[PDB]
Amino acid sequence: YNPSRVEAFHRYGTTVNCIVEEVDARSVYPYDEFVLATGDFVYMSPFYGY
Amino acid sequence: QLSRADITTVSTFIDLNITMLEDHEFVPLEVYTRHEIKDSGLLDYTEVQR
Numbered sequence: 435y436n437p438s439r440v441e442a443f444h445r446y447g448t449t450v451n452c453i454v455e456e457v458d459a460r461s462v463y464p465y466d467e468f469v470l471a472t473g474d475f476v477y478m479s480p481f482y483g484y
Numbered sequence: 485q486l487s488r489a490d491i492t493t494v495s496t497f498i499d500l501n502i503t504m505l506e507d508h509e510f511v512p513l514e515v516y517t518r519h520e521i522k523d524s525g526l527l528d529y530t531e532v533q534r
């Protein structure tokens with residue numbers, strides 16, 4: 435989404451697209467953190483819990 | 485007339501047993517295939533960028 439056309443004026447148009455994906459996570463010893471298929475690091479052990 | 489096997493026979497020769505070396509087949513063996521080594525990395529720049 436972009437703002438409608440108004441002459442000699444700046445306009446701001448916000449777009450929010452919810453996205454959900456199934457990614458393959460990987461982890462290595464000591465398994466204290468894991469990465470995702472998108473290359474994002476997650477600094478939490480995959481087995482962390484209560 | 486008596487057969488040749490009717491009299492006891494003693495071997496006058498010094499027997500020497502020779503056992504040829506049996507044929508051996510070598511099968512492929514790798515500790516870590518090239519695919520496993522590539523998969524050892526936590527992240528892959530090719531897959532992440534794709």
Ligand SMILES: *[C@@H]1O[C@H](CO)[C@@H](O)[C@H](O)[C@H]1NC(C)=O
Nearest residue numbers: 495497498499500501502503
């Ligand atoms: C092999 O050699 C031995 C002597 O070392 C002999 O007594 C024997 O008859 C030979 N042959 C076989 C089939 O064992």
